[PDB]
Structure 1
């Protein structure tokens, strides 16, 4: 059945633009293994067919067969329900927590890079670091799955590669596009890196950049930077 993902185009009007929700759905379709095409949209230069299929004008939108669906969270949950075993993998996380870990990081990052008032920098910046610390923590925590400490040098420390285990889940699809923007924009504009002592975070990102599902759906570094150039 025909699946076509509609995504934000970049500065040139055709390459993929900055947008973590676009990325998340793209990551979702990839991970399902279902065939799909992907279509980039210029919102200041909308095609006949784009107008015609989403008059509401929303991005991202999904065309499934002939039925249009909007709202990232709803499109994801639909795809998950629809694309089922035994044909397609279940992708939801198994630990309700994997769904909320790091969930507050993006807003904190946003409040921070948008702020222009020097006097209130340290608050926002320390808040962002704290929410990274809350994620790092979740990542180093052994999950129920694990419940076994093989090494002695690292007792009580998690070995897993992603939020919910050793496999990419729905939760990753949501956090990694957002985590990635955060890292790109903060580095570029402020010289702020995720401290190296956040070893869980750094392990997590090394593993996810070694997944083609994440790496090939990442907009150009340059494109994220341009998109944040004004607010920064």
Structure 2
């Protein structure tokens, strides 16, 4: 008998819609992939419900209610979920190859530096840094994993042809990178990074990812005071 599973996530600008938060998306995605029956409740952090205040006094977001147990810390929540929702009833989502768990994880810090910088003399250095991080990801994607034995992998995702926890982490981060770089830097992931573009097409084709993305407009609004014009 499945204990009740309810994920509390960041609300967006109207207090109700999906807010910008790659951690909330990461977990919505894990739960979707597990096949478990769950609920998702958005939280307006300036206008919290009484239930939320009692469930999670610390105020952290996302958090999970599992039966009457609360869990904070996205990574720990992810671990918990991978362990308790397990086969036979639910699929193991962990990657087979440990480097799937790290591939592309530096892109986000590179992106953050790029968009926060206002020193024009430093802008091309930061762009190059983000580009090199994307290219290390493009290389991981196009390199055949063991389970595949031209030399260009055609697997759909980071670890193989199925979505794993690893994609649930990276895909929400890459999404923000795309939307915010287009809007504030006029920067686009070069078409020549074909592994990265095949991955994203595959990902946007899957509802687990598409359906759990905040709107562009919300991501853009979230970065409005943080993205700096060069001066």
TM-score, shorter chain, exceeding 0.5: yes
Cα deviations by residue, 1:139-195 (Å, 9 ceiling, x for unpaired): 000110111xxxxxxx11101000000000000000000000000100111110000
Secondary structure in 2 aligned to 1:173?
helix
Cα deviations by residue, 1:109-160 (Å, 9 ceiling, x for unpaired): 011111111121111111000000000000000110111xxxxxxx111010
- Give distance in 1, aligned partners of 2:200 and 2:139: 14
Deviation (angstroms), 1:73? 0.3
Report the TM-score, using the length of structure 1 for normalisation.
0.96
Secondary structure in 1 aligned to 2:41?
strand
Deviation (angstroms), 1:61? 0.3
- Give distance in 2, aligned partners of 1:122 and 1:191: 13
Segments of structure 1 that go 5 or more residues without pairing to the other structure are 148-154
- Give distance in 1, aligned partners of 2:171 and 2:28: 12
Deviation (angstroms), 1:78? 0.5
RMSD, matched Cα? 0.5
Deviation (angstroms), 1:200? 0.1
Secondary structure in 2 aligned to 1:204?
helix
Secondary structure in 2 aligned to 1:121?
helix
Segments of structure 2 that go 5 or more residues without pairing to the other structure are 227-231
Deviation (angstroms), 1:90? 0.4
Secondary structure in 1 aligned to 2:157?
coil
Report the TM-score, using the length of structure 2 for normalisation.
0.96
